[PDB]
Amino acid sequence: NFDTSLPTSHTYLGADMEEFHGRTLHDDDSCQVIPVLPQVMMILIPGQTLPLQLFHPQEVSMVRNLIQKDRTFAVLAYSNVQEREAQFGTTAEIYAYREEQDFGIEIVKVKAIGRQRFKVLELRTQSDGIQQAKVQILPEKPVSREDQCSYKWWQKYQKRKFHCDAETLMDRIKKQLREWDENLKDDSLPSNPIDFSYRVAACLPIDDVLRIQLLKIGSAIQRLRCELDIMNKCTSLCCKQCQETEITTKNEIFSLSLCGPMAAYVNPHGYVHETLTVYKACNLNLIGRPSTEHSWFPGYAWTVAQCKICASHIGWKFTATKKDMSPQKFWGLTRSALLPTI
Amino acid sequence: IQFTRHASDVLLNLNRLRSRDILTDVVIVVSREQFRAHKTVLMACSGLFYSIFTDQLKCNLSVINLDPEINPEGFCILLDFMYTSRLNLREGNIMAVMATAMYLQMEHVVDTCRKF
Amino acid sequence: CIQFTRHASDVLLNLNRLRSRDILTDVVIVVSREQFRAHKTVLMACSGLFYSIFTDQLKCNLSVINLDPEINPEGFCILLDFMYTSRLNLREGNIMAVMATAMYLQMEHVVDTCRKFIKA
Numbered sequence: 018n019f020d021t022s023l024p025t026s027h028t029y030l031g032a033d034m035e036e037f038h039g040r041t042l043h044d045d046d047s048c049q050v051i052p053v054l055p056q057v058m059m060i061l062i063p064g065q066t067l068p069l070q071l072f073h074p075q076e077v078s079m080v081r082n083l084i085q086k087d088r089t090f091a092v093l094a095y096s097n098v099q100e101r102e103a104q105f106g107t108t109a110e111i112y113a114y115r116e117e118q119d120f121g122i123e124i125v126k127v128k129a130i131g132r133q134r135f136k137v138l139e140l141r142t143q144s145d146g147i148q149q150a151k152v153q154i155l156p157e158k159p160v161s162r163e164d165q166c167s168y169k170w171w172q173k174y175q176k177r178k179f180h181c182d183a184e185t186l187m188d189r190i191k192k193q194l195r196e197w198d199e200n201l202k203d204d205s206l207p208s209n210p211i212d213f214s215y216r217v218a219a220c221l222p223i224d225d226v227l228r229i230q231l232l233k234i235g236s237a238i239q240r241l242r243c244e245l246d247i248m249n250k251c252t253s254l255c256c257k258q259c260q261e262t263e264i265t266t267k268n269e270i271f272s273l274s275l276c277g278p279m280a281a282y283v284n285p286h287g288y289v290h291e292t293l294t295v296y297k298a299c300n301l302n303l304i305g306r307p308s309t310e311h312s313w314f315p316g317y318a319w320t321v322a323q324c325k326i327c328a329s330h331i332g333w334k335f336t337a338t339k340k341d342m343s344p345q346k347f348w349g350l351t352r353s354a355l356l357p358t359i
Numbered sequence: 360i361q362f363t364r365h366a367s368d369v370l371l372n373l374n375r376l377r378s379r380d381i382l383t384d385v386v387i388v389v390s391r392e393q394f395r396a397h398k399t400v401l402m403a404c405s406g407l408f409y410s411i412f413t414d415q416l417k418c419n420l421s422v423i424n425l426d427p428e429i430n431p432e433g434f435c436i437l438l439d440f441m442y443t444s445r446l447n448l449r450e451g452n453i454m455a456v457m458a459t460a461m462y463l464q465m466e467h468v469v470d471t472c473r474k475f
Numbered sequence: 476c477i478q479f480t481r482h483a484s485d486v487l488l489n490l491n492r493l494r495s496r497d498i499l500t501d502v503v504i505v506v507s508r509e510q511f512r513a514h515k516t517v518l519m520a521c522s523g524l525f526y527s528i529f530t531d532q533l534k535c536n537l538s539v540i541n542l543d544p545e546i547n548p549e550g551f552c553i554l555l556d557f558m559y560t561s562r563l564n565l566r567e568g569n570i571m572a573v574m575a576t577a578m579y580l581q582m583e584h585v586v587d588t589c590r591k592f593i594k595a
């Protein structure tokens with residue numbers, strides 16, 4: 018019953034956001050210098066939305082200057098946090114902006130979207146704490162889904178085309194994605210192989226090492242093959258701080274926004290979570306009472322949920338408030354705090 | 360054990376309360392303009408407010424009017440400095456800010472203004 | 476703009492000074508049959524539990540608040556002192572009780588500190 022387009026708007030940030038219609042792509046195999054934000058611990062994939070709320074003086078100044086000049090920055094895919102070294106990254110583009118003054122406080126709300134992948138040669142820190150990286154840009158059916166019509170039709174397609182694959186791999190991935198979401202409609206998933214592969218890669222609930230390994234792949238067919246394998250081997254998700262506890266199973270997850278099962282949301286303190294929605298959670302304990310301010314799913318009330326045999330923070334409750342809403346109960350879980358198991 | 364950010368965060372939470380106008384028990388009138396806040400915070404930042412709210416007769420006043428000619432922008436900026444420990448001086452108001460701090464008996468702020 | 480990295484500590488010191496003299500204190504908390512008087516505003520600035528209690532339009536008018544009777548009173552007192560002084564007095568003989576009381580009070584960073592010290 019719940020509208021599945023609403024979460025993607027990130028309405029909780031603010032209804033009034035200065036918006037920019039534009040796009041800029043760097044010539045492939047070129048060399049350019051890009052600034053990167055002080056701390057962004059997420060492997061941003063092209064076509065994935067990213068909200069931020071920044072506080073620091075240098076951050077607000079540099080992002081303001083960015084939106085004045087070129088409207089893009091860089092996000093480095095760190096292999097590990099402590100070393101601070103990385104060799105690939107993604108350019109992100111600002112497409113929504115707002116600056117907020119609250120009784121002397123200053124913050125900046127922003128929404129960006131990934132565009133291009135790149136390799137970093139070396140990075141140099143200028144005096145004011147901004148990091149500038151030298152970087153080379155990396156180059157890139159029946160109307161009804163009725164079973165029998167698709168069966169004979171696909172046999173015929175295979176016979177005709179290879180009488181002497183992109184569509185086939187996309188079709189199988191779409192079959193799995195539909196297994197996740199019955200309401201899923203084809204026109205929502207892009208028909209271009211590249212966009213489809215990026216969307217699937219973003220939807221996959223997988224750890225960062227696989228994320229970067231998948232981001233480095235330069236061919237759409239290779240991405241689709243790797244995604245097919247990963248989707249068809251993932252078993253369940255386990256608390257990162259237990260190494261063995263069943264919080265969710267593959268079949269429990271259910272998409273609730275156009276972005277897919279998993280998306281990116283932001284905290285009132287500027288920290289970013291990747292949230293995955295599921296209608297069944299285990300080994301979780303609730304603390305406190307329902308609240309609704311700054312809620313990520315409008316009409317729902319969240320309650321922190323902690324790994325009950327681990328005392329570590331995992332997710333939330335999100336019980337609906339009105340009693341005409343179909344999912345009267347579901348759950349959100351933080352990808353950063355659980356790992357795949359096999 | 361000591362918390363490096365406990366004080367700053369508690370101040371920010373108090374500012375969040377002020378912005379949402381929650382449990383604010385007093386209002387200050389400067390230059391015919393009103394600013395609502397809490398007595399405890401005001402008396403913790405100003406000698407004037409400390410004197411007023413430690414006075415057993417005046418502490419019951421939920422409305423307080425200062426010297427009418429105190430600049431409103433200066434009082435507002437000083438109140439924001441009270442609630443964020445941050446003071447944004449500028450060329451066009453430093454004199455008024457210094458005068459208002461003197462009226463409020465905020466010696467450190469007045470002394471800092473003397474330097475600029 | 477400029478910053479006064481000590482002004483916040485000065486404000487906390489003044490508030491603790493007022494607390495020590497019971498000036499403008501408006502609430503009393505009963506923990507383990509023992510009373511502790513303080514200001515609601517400070518409590519809700521440091522505890523999610525008190526935030527919920529005093530943001531409830533029915534319960535904010537209350538001048539007396541009784542917690543879970545089995546919460547450690549010594550831990551509650553130490554946490555109140557930490558609220559008013561940015562200083563937490565942890566010892567082996569109370570660390571677990573302090574952590575439990577903090578979790579009951581829904582004080583995130585306090586429980587985080589307890590976890591950090593217990594891990595060591």
Ligand SMILES: CN(c1ncc(Cl)c(Nc2ccc3c(c2)n(CCC(C)(C)O)c(=O)n3C)n1)C1CCN(c2ccc3c([C@H]4CCC(=O)NC4=O)nn(C)c3c2)CC1
Nearest residue numbers: 284311312313319368372375519520521523526581582583
């Ligand atoms: C407005 N407001 C406020 N105003 C005034 C005061 Cl006075 C005040 N006080 C206070 C209260 C409770 C404290 C506390 C201080 N402190 C600090 C103590 C100390 C000593 C360090 O200061 C501490 O630890 N707790 C528990 N809190 C709060 C309102 C709630 N709000 C919030 C809302 C949503 C999310 C999410 C997710 C959830 C899922 C989702 O869908 N959306 C999300 O974004 N995650 N998080 C983290 C959220 C946090 C926080 C601000």
Ligand SMILES: [Zn+2]
Nearest residue numbers: 256259324327
């Ligand atoms: Zn666990």
